[PDB]
């Protein structure tokens, strides 16, 4: 299963850097023991070589993550940005992606990694849900993601 708790959702202020975002989303994961203590460092380094910006049409989405060996227990951490922050394109495109929704993925094995990536690719095709993420409070974001994750787990 995937651990997803109320404190795995947060809104982030202006003037946050890409690294700050990674560190902020990794923080509750580290504090619950979901990831190794230097998890943020590993996500930063992997982002430098395998960028996670997704140019979907409401606003940009990023899916920062690192190797499964740095994850202790499956988890996801979500961040909503007050203003767009650039991530390099996850497909080798020249144009950077202005991102406002960040799904930090902490999956501890390959079969769960690929299954969640498939699921994410489906979720971001819902332009209206993505738009809802930009206005809902942390509670409503948590409930909506929790329900979708539980539906993923059923099957």
């Amino acid at each position, epitope marked *: 299963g995937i651990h997803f708790r109320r404190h795995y959702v947060r809104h982030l202020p202006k003037e946050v850097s890409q690294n700050d975002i990674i560190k902020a989303l990794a923080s509750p994961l580290i504090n619950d023991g979901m990831v190794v203590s230097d998890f943020a460092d590993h996500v930063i380094t992997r982002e430098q070589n395998f960028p996670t910006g997704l140019p979907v049409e409401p606003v940009g989405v990023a*899916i920062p993550h690192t190797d*499964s*060996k740095y*994850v202790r227990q499956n988890a996801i951490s979500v961040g909503i940005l007050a203003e767009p922050v650039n991530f390099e394109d*996850a*497909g080798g495109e020249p144009d950077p992606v202005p991102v406002r929704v960040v799904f930090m993925l902490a999956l*501890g*094995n*390959w*079969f769960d*990694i*690929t*299954n969640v*990536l*498939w699921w994410i*690719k489906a979720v971001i095709q819902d332009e209206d849900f993505m738009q809802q993420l930009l206005v809902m409070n942390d509670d409503e974001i948590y409930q909506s993601i929790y329900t979708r994750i539980s539906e993923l787990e059923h099957h």
Partner: antibody
Amino acid sequence: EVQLVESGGGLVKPGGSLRLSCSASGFDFDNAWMTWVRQPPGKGLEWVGRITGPGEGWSVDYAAPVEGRFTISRLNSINFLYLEMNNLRMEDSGLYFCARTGKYYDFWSGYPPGEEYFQDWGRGTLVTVSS
Amino acid sequence: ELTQETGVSVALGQTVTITCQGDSLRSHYASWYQKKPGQAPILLFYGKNNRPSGVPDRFSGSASGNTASLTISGAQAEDDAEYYCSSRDKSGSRLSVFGGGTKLTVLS
């Protein structure tokens, strides 16, 4: 850099048992997936099975013709991979290779569980089943 | 499973494409291997467009429909070898499988 060395191959009668080993060096073995592949005389490469890493609980998958007769295992402390083979058949003869196994998944075009590919190979150990 | 041509012959220096076909390829990429007698197999190409460091640029992989292709642009005498495809045996499978292999005869 990467060194893979199979051993343990030899002559065995049909119905017999054999244990193959593979020493690994030059990479992070504990987190590496490892695969056995064989090539029967005159035939092509055949996937035998693969053992995963700790995040997968070291689960193993096997090709249908060897399921139940063959057992793949690993010893992480000394970087060894093993293949134990029971009730051997003539058709089990051939060159057995161990391979360091990478995992691939393209986000935009991929389908789970992606693909496994064999990035480093040993030179093989020869198994001969004969009466 | 996965199907490859048994044998393909190519004149020295010419471009040749060998193919690998199977239903799983509609969902999964193939990887490609060269095998010479008495030598370990070598990975040539995998995924959408990944060539390992050290593999000559004249080897390229591509994919369309339920087929995967390996193209050698300007075959050398040393490219005479067995070539194998590998992928999932069925879509979404945790198992892997090789195609039957293609013997590439480069007429040198």
